Amino acid sequence: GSTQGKILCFYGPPGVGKTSIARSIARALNREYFRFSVGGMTDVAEIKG
Amino acid sequence: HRRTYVGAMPGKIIQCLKKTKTENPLILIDEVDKIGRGYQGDPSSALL
Ligand SMILES: Nc1ncnc2c1ncn2[C@@H]1O[C@H](COP(=O)(O)OP(=O)(O)O)[C@@H](O)[C@H]1O
């Protein structure tokens, strides 16, 4: 029936093409894309205002 | 700053854009190597 959510993770050597597949899937399913780096953060407010 | 804080003024970049009056100047960040990476909000994330 209806649309459904799910979580996933990818891992491997840097520069294998990961993010590129991300956006390609986003234009495959037609869902909207939005990158969000979180490297090195400690500000929970960034995740919650 | 947010402009709701008292005394807020636009960030440095807007001033350079205001000053050079063109859309495509040649910004020159200087001395990137010693940027202050502290607990008070690390600019190095802001540069990205
Ligand atoms: N199999 C592939 N198909 C398409 N692009 C690839 C492939 N392998 C590497 N790339 C290129 O590698 C670069 C980095 O890929 P990406 O996963 O988006 O970033 P990172 O690799 O840092 O995670 C991209 O510009 C992408 O085009």
Curated annotation (Swiss-Prot), chain B:
Tissue: Duodenum, heart, lung and liver, but not thymus.
Compartments where found: Mitochondrion matrix
Disease per UniProt entry: CODAS syndrome: A rare syndrome characterized by the combination of cerebral, ocular, dental, auricular, and skeletal features. These include developmental delay, craniofacial anomalies, cataracts, ptosis, median nasal groove, delayed tooth eruption, hearing loss, short stature, delayed epiphyseal ossification, metaphyseal hip dysplasia, and vertebral coronal clefts.
Family that this chain belongs to: Belongs to the peptidase S16 family.
Description of its domains: The Lon N-terminal domains are crucial for the overall structure of the protein, maintaining it in a conformation allowing its proper functioning. The AP-domain (ATP-binding and proteolytic domains) has a closed-ring conformation in the presence of AMP-PNP and its N-terminal entry gate appears closed. Upon ADP binding, it switches to a lock-washer conformation and its N-terminal gate opens.
Oligomeric form and interacting partners: Homohexamer. Organized in a ring with a central cavity. The ATP-binding and proteolytic domains (AP-domain) form a hexameric chamber, while the N-terminal domain is arranged as a trimer of dimers. DNA and RNA binding is stimulated by substrate and inhibited by ATP binding. Interacts with TWNK and mitochondrial DNA polymerase subunit POLG.
Entry function: ATP-dependent serine protease that mediates the selective degradation of misfolded, unassembled or oxidatively damaged polypeptides as well as certain short-lived regulatory proteins in the mitochondrial matrix. Endogenous substrates include mitochondrial steroidogenic acute regulatory (StAR) protein, DELE1, helicase Twinkle (TWNK) and the large ribosomal subunit protein MRPL32/bL32m. MRPL32/bL32m is protected from degradation by LONP1 when it is bound to a nucleic acid (RNA), but TWNK is not. May also have a chaperone function in the assembly of inner membrane protein complexes.
UniProt name for this protein: Lon protease homolog, mitochondrial
Part of the full-length chain shown: 561 to 608 of 959
